[PDB]
Design a protein around this nucleic acid. Structure first.
Ligand SMILES: [Zn+2]
Ligand SMILES: [Zn+2]
Ligand SMILES: [Zn+2]
Lengths: 196, 194, 195
DNA sequence: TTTCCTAGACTTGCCCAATTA
DNA sequence: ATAATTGGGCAAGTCTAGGAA
């Protein structure tokens, strides 16, 4: 079938695992993750921290890349991108390309790719060790379009694929989580878990 | 211009074969002998077998192209719907406007005819391997038949064309195709129909 | 031409017109009525016309189409698109915006405008029927609804299809009525019923 | 001549639940 | 448990006949 980006979990030689903040579902939450759903709920354009767990430090030049792909097989060949309303928004942080759904916050070494071959979008940052006195590395992502954006994701489930790659682009590890960009993350999360 | 769906089992005796898929609900690809219709899912493998009576010369290429089955619509270049085209992906070769792609063939070529704008994918004709009887081409349909803005629910014909390095028609075949979710349930049904 | 003749003349080549076969469905964009010898269709869509012949007209031959009002009282007036529709429909670099009738799918179209009669025509080159075909097909588009106030204004038109030579001398001639509308099928179904 | 309707019955993707191995 | 595959069924969305202003 038409090839699509790989999404299988691979801890790699460095024991790469992804972590998240345990925020709860109170009404004030801006980003909340559900361990039972392996799903992150976040508000549009707000901070979404993502934790990198490693058992041994990766080599130097190590990069961390994120990519969104549709969860359903029937839509996997579709490149996740912002709806037209959104790409057209003046919400540029000056670094990200207007069509990318995923941005990286507060990292001037941030890099964006428009795959020449797959048309696929992604964001990379250099991998940093955990801030001394720290257990893991944190990355602040932002999702720039809502799940309900007709014309975009349109209510379809998206996965965020986090890849650990050497300076040459080789795969060192991969992990993933589903995401839902919506106005009320606490409410939505509670509910979807309410269903189980 | 415009292209024919006129069989030309030619001087080589060109014929197409299809696998025996089964009718589960949502089978990936399935062909209906009675209907002469392929029923597949978007982006899924659509195997099409090439059978000749005699090996064609070298330079021979295979071309695929779609057309609306219906009279009026035959003039409308068949292409991907706006949405899918906009959010298209690719494989380093396939252009975003093409509906039909060829899977696993690093020698594939994609054409948008300058004078018809008509789109097509052509691969070289490869004689079957020693001990084989036919040659398979795997195709993928990039939009469902019901893609509003595209297929808009209208029937298409895939027309395979054997041709020489020159572009001369050496042979011709066709099949209708229905890209849908659930090719299984839909072939049964459209059979039940008779 | 003040008002070109619309008389049928198969002439030396056995020139005939052919038409597709669809019923009165709403979903039927274009539809020909043999009884009414009228063709209904809807704005901007495909109008397939079958060019039958008994004798193969020589290379260079041409097929010109022209609309004329049907009523005598309207005959001398040129059929043109309304001013509205005229300020947009110009897509397909060959078709001038005023022309009501266009042909699609032919690199060689040639639009006319009698400099002395102001009538608008779409010319094409005669072409033999497809290898295993018994007729050549032309794809016509009617650029305005017969409704266009300011355009056809509810007035019936006739399309005269002529076979002519490189010089433009007439060879054969047919014609038929056209009704550009809103969901054509019914109109025929009905047009055929008062009958 | 268009424009509304009123539904009903399909068309058709995709949910969910059972079920495989 | 655990993923993949499947079949049941559904409901958003389509076009219908059809009468009406
Ligand atoms: Zn959006
Ligand atoms: Zn599509
Ligand atoms: Zn008009």
């Amino acid at each position: 079938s038409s090839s699509v980006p790989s999404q299988k979990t691979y801890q790699g030689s460095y024991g790469f695992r992804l972590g998240f903040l345990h925020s709860g579902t109170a009404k004030s939450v801006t980003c909340t993750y559900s361990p039972a759903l392996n799903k992150m709920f976040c508000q549009l354009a707000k901070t979404c921290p993502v934790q990198l767990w490693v058992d041994s430090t990766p080599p130097p030049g190590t990069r961390v890349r994120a990519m969104a792909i549709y969860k359903q097989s029937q839509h996997m060949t579709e490149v996740v991108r912002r709806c037209p309303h959104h790409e057209r928004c003046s919400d540029s942080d000056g670094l990200a390309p207007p069509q990318h759904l995923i941005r990286v916050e507060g990292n001037l070494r941030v890099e964006y790719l428009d795959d020449r071959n797959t048309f696929r979008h992604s964001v990379v940052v250099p991998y940093e060790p955990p801030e001394v006195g720290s257990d893991c590395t944190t990355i602040h992502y932002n999702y720039m379009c809502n799940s309900s954006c007709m014309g975009g994701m349109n209510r379809r489930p998206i996965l965020t694929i986090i890849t650990l790659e050497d300076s040459s682009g080789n795969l060192l590890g991969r992990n993933s989580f589903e995401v839902r960009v919506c106005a009320c993350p606490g409410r939505d999360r509670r509910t979807e878990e309410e269903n189980l």
